[PDB]
């Protein structure tokens, strides 16, 4: 029972080829644009009217002709046509004097638009040159449904067509697009038309072009475009692109050049998403592509590397094979998320990029997918808002986690084969759910890799058509040598019976034979529950999900939880580190949902004293963060600090001062960042003094710049009780950087001062007009409240003053005000803070309506209440160590 709509185009007519010409004088900051399009189309059901899409465009003329011999051959003028647009369905209808009969026709429309300023259609972007002058560029973003903002078209992904694009623009600017340049022609006194080669069959949402004065770096058939003053930061992207494209060529067994003679990447200063996979011309926001080793962090580099991998994966999964309709958008975004980490790991083996997948995708997916509002992977949509809303954690991380599950179940070679079958089959066409299963099946037909009578499709449908994921319960009738397992839907929040039955692949491992590295032994639960007969002593632990490859949580009897717990106390590395990470996150969420005694889960985490690897500590960091945030303003908070001190103080035998030795790995860097972060949060004076000194050493001249891989921590803590000269130094550094990611990190870092007078002055700089972008001014507010309770207070004190909320609201919106109020609410934990909040609401007067005020109080009250709820009592209790 999913009702949708009549927002779908009439099915009477169908595109064949678009011949698009656009003119823009964006070099002059002229923001109108003009266009003509010649659309070759097929009529299937005889009609008087051709219906396609338009948002915002104003037609000036239109006419039709027939093509009596196909697409080559001459047209014969039928007549001028009538145009009208429905603003709600965004259907434009061209109406002929005659009724057209099933054949090939040529529609020709002249039209005029304007460049968006919300980063969505054909829009404007800009940057500031080294001499202070602002320079404009026109660029595109169509995915979802915005190709209709640049030219009238059949804007649905299943209606693939060829595209021949030409653009008129300033002689002094360059145009690029999906396809290579076919030819320049200078015109008038000032201008030029750039012509592009015809595309293959593709969807409108992937069409793209850019008109700018940018520069390129290159290597063979691949370039990277950047604003001229970012040229030195484009080297990494070009390396990564070459390596990643090749890995994918080989692995999938279809080279990219099978269909395209070049692949460009471009960094666009104003960009809504992280990046967009337009065939042959992939757009990025700057933070997703630029890297500068003097100031960019290992995290930043990882973001560039994964994003490139993500969008290159789309050249096959999305571009070559596109979704028939958005219901199957996971066919794109699931594979892109998986290969975001997998292709990258194949492209830089030994940098342990693939480890990042378990915490950044699997566990991340389970968090959102444990909510009652989560959707099934297959889920339809009709309106533009409904379509955007599909681009969520289910389309991305969930899909990517289940695909990773399938990949392991099928085996590497079968997997590759399956995909090559799929891609080959649906090449230059649309795909749905079942066509993928067909492909994967073919590569294992007769090979007896699945139990007899079971399809690839039988399995995937249980995961694809059902919201959420299961928890697999494992109960042992111990001293008696059996195990019972059973499955129910997992919620973060509640236990609610569910009729659907996931076909779940499982395996398991016991204490004497502790091998987690093979995947030959996959078993299936295809019913609600089952008895597993077995060999294992009541003294040995068992653990079910090998390296958390299966997309499900696992719960055990308190017995087996305690066996496990003991085993990791005596020898902390006795279980695979990903499985330790599974146990940590599983225990955490099982306790929160009330499927497991909190006391048990907390007992299980004491083992971390001895822990030394990246995955488990990353998992732990999420549980600890939650507890930290709920205890913070409360009396019991001291005992939490003590408890966590106990957990880390050992592993705090790393180097955080100068951490960076050339030999320490990616994973090490993450680990160092997580542990030092905690130590500094807790006020380890060693941590606070070293960071403080480093910053002082760089701001003073005494010493070198702080290495980027340690800057996040060092600049934030280190600023805690720093003096005016170090605050100003860091502030001037940010204002002089032309690097967005740097700027953001420094804005956050300034936010960590404990000095309320610094914070308020800092906030004042974000108001009025220094060179913040809008997003950065908002960022300053966020830095201040995210710094700690002292910034929150600084912010509240600021907003109490009515003249100050006046300035605040005139330069940021009221939405930024309501946003900050929510943030403050999320961080009030005690009576004294609740007073401060209520005082602010009241002081703000007519800016806060009753509804919102009620909401703020509600989220704040939930925090105060939390301290004496069952959780919270259970926890304050447990923190009665002695």
């Amino acid at each position: 029972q999913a009702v949708d709509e009549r927002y779908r185009l009439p099915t009477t007519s169908i595109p064949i080829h678009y011949d698009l010409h656009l003119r823009t004088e964006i070099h002059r900051n002229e923001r109108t644009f003009t266009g003509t399009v010649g659309i070759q189309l097929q009529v299937v059901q005889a009609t008087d009217k051709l219906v396609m899409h338009n948002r915002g465009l104003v037609m000036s003329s239109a006419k039709v002709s027939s093509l009596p011999n196909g697409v080559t051959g001459a047209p014969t003028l039928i007549g001028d046509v009538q145009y009208s647009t429905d603003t709600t369905f965004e259907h434009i209808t061209f109406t002929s004097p005659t009724i057209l009969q099933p054949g090939t026709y040529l529609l020709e429309v002249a039209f005029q638009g304007r460049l968006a300023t919300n980063d969505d259609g054909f829009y404007v972007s800009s940057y500031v040159a080294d001499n202070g002058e602002r320079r404009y560029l026109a660029t595109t973003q169509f995915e979802s449904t915005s190709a209709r903002m640049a030219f009238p078209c059949y804007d649905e992904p299943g209606l693939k067509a060829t595209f021949t694009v030409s653009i008129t623009h300033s002689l002094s600017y360059k145009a690029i697009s999906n396809m290579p340049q076919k030819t320049t022609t200078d015109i008038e006194t000032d201008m030029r038309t750039t012509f592009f080669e015809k595309t293959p069959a593709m969807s409108t949402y992937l069409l793209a072009f850019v008109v700018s004065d940018f520069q390129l770096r290159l290597s063979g058939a691949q370039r990277v475009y950047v604003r001229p003053n970012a040229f030195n930061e484009a080297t990494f992207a070009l390396e990564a692109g070459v390596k990643i494209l090749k890995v994918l060529d080989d692995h999938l067994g279809i080279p990219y050049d099978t269909y395209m003679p070049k692949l460009d990447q471009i960094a666009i200063p104003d960009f809504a998403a992280g990046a967009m996979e337009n065939w042959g011309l992939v757009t990025y926001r700057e933070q997703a592509l630029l890297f500068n080793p003097a100031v960019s962090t290992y995290r930043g580099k990882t973001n560039v590397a994964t994003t490139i991998a993500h969008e290159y994966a789309h050249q096959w999964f999305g571009n070559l094979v596109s979704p028939e309709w958005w219901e199957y958008i996971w066919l794109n975004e699931g594979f892109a998320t998986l290969y975001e980490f997998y292709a990258l790991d194949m492209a830089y083996p030994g940098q342990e990029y693939w480890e990042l997948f378990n915490q950044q995708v699997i566990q991340y997916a389970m968090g959102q997918d444990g909510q009652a509002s989560t959707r099934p992977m297959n889920w339809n949509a009709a309106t533009p808002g409904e379509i955007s809303a599909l681009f969520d954690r289910v389309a991305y991380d969930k899909s990517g986690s289940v695909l990773n599950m399938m990949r392991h179940v099928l085996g590497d070679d079968n997997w590759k084969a399956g995909l090559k079958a799929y891609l080959t089959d649906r090449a230059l066409q649309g795909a749905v759910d079942e066509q993928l299963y067909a492909g994967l099946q073919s590569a294992i037909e007769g090979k007896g890799v699945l139990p007899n009578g079971v399809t690839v499709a039988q399995i995937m449908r249980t995961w694809t058509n059902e919201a959420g994921y299961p928890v697999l319960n494992v109960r042992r009738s111990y001293d008696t040598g059996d195990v019972i397992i059973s499955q129910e839907r997992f919620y973060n929040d509640r236990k609610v019976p569910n009729t659907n039955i996931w076909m779940i692949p499982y395996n398991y491992v016991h204490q004497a034979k502790a091998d987690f590295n093979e995947f030959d032994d996959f078993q299936w639960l295809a019913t609600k529950a089952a008895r597993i007969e077995t060999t294992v002593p009541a003294n040995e632990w068992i653990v079910f999900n090998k390296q958390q490859v299966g997309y499900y949580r696992v719960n055990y009897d308190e017995h087996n939880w305690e066996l496990i717990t003991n085993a990791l106390h005596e020898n902390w590395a006795s279980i695979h580190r990903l499985n330790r990470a599974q146990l940590i996150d599983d225990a955490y969420w099982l306790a929160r949902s009330g499927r497991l005694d909190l006391r048990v889960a907390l007992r299980f985490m004491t083992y971390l004293r001895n822990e030394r690897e990246y995955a488990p500590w990353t998992a732990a960091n999420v549980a600890l963060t939650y507890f930290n945030n709920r205890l913070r303003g409360t009396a019991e908070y001291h005992n939490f600090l003590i408890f966590v001190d106990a957990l880390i103080e050992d592993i705090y035998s790393l180097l955080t001062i100068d951490a960076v030795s050339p030999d320490d790995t990616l994973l090490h860097k993450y680990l160092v960042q997580t542990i030092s972060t905690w130590a500094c949060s807790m006020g380890y004076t060693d941590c606070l003094m070293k960071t403080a000194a480093l910053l002082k050493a760089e701001a003073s001249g005494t010493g070198p710049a702080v290495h980027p891989d340690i800057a996040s921590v060092t600049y934030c803590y280190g600023m805690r009780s720093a003096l005016e000269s170090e605050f100003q130094y860091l502030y001037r550094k940010m204002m002089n950087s032309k690097n967005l990611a740097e700027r953001t990190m420094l804005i956050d870092s300034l936010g960590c001062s404990n000095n309320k007078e610094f914070l308020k002055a800092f906030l004042t700089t974000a108001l009025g007009s220094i060179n913040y972008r809008a997003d950065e001014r908002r960022r300053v507010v966020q830095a201040i409240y995210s710094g700690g309770r002292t910034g929150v207070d600084a912010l509240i004190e600021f907003l109490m003053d009515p003249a100050l909320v006046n300035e605040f609201v005139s330069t940021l919106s009221t939405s930024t005000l309501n946003s900050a109020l929510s943030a403050i609410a999320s961080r009030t934990n005690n009576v004294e803070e609740m007073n401060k909040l209520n005082a602010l609401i009241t002081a703000l007067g007519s800016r806060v309506n009753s509804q919102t005020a009620a909401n703020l109080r509600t989220t704040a009250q939930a925090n105060l209440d939390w301290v004496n709820g069952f959780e919270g009592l259970m926890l304050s209790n447990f923190l009665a160590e002695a």
């Binding site: 998403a273 992280g274 926001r285 997703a288 973001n303 681009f391």
Partner: peptide
């Protein structure tokens, strides 16, 4: 696309 972190 790739989303914003």
């Amino acid at each position: 696309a790739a989303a914003k972190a």
